[PDB]
Amino acid sequence: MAPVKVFGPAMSTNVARVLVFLEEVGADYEVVDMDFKVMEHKSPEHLARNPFGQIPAFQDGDLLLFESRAISKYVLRKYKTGEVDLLREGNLKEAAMVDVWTEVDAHTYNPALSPIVYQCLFNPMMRGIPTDEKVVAESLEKLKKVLEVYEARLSQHEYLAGDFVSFADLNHFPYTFYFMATPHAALFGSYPHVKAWWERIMARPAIKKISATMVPPKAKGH
Ligand SMILES: N[C@@H](CCC(=O)N[C@@H](CSCc1ccc([N+](=O)[O-])cc1)C(=O)NCC(=O)O)C(=O)O
């Protein structure tokens, strides 16, 4: 039957996103590393997997996929356990709530948090480009407003879609993980329900496993 293949280094946020869901359902998989220093993601071979020249790409037999959230939902459906139901697709209103807060991550939370990761981590280390502190300052003020909403939401439920962990919650892991390595990692402590939610996510065996393969400078970067 052959395990599925993920193309891209495990440290890349959107690769890690897929690996988390693979681990949640206990599926075998192969991580195919790629050399960004020779721009392997822009090679003719990889463009045939992801025509926009990005990672992850994904292969299951003759099926090629890209876009991390699409890959992840395919994994969750293919390996649907019964022991794990992260999409709630058998329940219309639960699936809707999972969908809402998955979209919130994609279009409200991650656009506020991701720039801080880029400016404080990716740009200086990976690209040799210094931190633009005005982008950081503007993004932090937006993130704080987002976190005020999350704090209220997570005061009523343990997770974002209700009293169950879901696709919505776990999609928050890869970029927030790296945020915890920036100078702004203490931010969450001002939002106690958000911090507790985050710690529940970090306690998950699948999350523990993948975060160990991403390895920051050292865990919660000081
Ligand atoms: N929507 C897509 C986004 C995928 C994506 O952005 N992949 C990035 C790597 S993860 C995000 C990321 C970007 C940059 C760094 N960095 O260190 O400079 C780290 C992580 C990529 O391949 N970029 C190459 C390109 O677009 O040309 C998905 O979720 O799959």
Ligand code: NA
């Ligand atoms: Na990019």
Ligand code: NA
């Ligand atoms: Na599911």
Ligand code: NA
């Ligand atoms: Na918004």
